[PDB]
Amino acid sequence: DNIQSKLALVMRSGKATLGYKSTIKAIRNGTAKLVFISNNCPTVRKSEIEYYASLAQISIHHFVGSNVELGTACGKYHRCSTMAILDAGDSDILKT
RNA sequence: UAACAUACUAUGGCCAUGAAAUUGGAUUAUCCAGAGAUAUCGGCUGUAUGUAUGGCAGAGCAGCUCAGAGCUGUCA
Ligand SMILES: [Mg+2]
Ligand SMILES: [Mg+2]
């Protein structure tokens, strides 16, 4: 429930971007508050992103699932290896 | 209108920019996309048994003369 609900929330109230380019760009520009990576993420991206985040001190969430679960979770109809939560109004996770 | 010379075009693939849900794009057929589709006075690249010029008209071809030389057209 934590994840599904949290993200559903984040989507309703908040701003996020899906995908690799938008996620990295988000880290770069500093807009990225929280980063999600899937089980299916190609390694190179998993480690690359992991690095961009450590360096920018953003917190990375490793999802419990694969592309479909992510996309579905975000109430989108497309698959996503990596995702960025920008601003979520009501969800606790952003803060902890 | 030869190989060959130079410059351009050629079913595909790439690079930017930006991301797509009232999902779109696309083939006769399939098929592709947030693992970034579509789209930009956008850009790069690959293949001619393509185009232009050189070759080349002087050659070849078709006619017409002169007593071996000569003339005309070979176009769009
Ligand atoms: Mg082309
Ligand atoms: Mg002649």
Swiss-Prot record:
Q: One MF term from GO for this chain? A: RNA binding
**Keyword Cell wall biogenesis/degradation: yes or no?**
no
GO CC, sorted alphabetically, is: ribonucleoprotein complex; ribosome
Looking up PROSITE patterns in the UniProt record yields: RIBOSOMAL_L30E_2
Q: Which Gene3D superfamilies match?
A: 3.30.1330.30
UniProt xrefs under Pfam families:
Ribosomal_L7Ae
Q: Which UniProt keywords apply?
A: Ribonucleoprotein, Ribosomal protein
Quote the InterPro entries the UniProt record gives: Ribosomal_eL30-like (IPR039109), Ribosomal_eL30-like_sf (IPR029064), Ribosomal_eL30_CS (IPR022991), Ribosomal_eL8/eL30/eS12/Gad45 (IPR004038)
Record keyword Ribosomal protein present: yes
- What is stated as this protein's family in its record? Belongs to the eukaryotic ribosomal protein eL30 family.
Name of this protein: Large ribosomal subunit protein eL30
Species the sequence originates in: Tetrahymena thermophila (strain SB210)
Which gene does this sequence derive from? RPL30
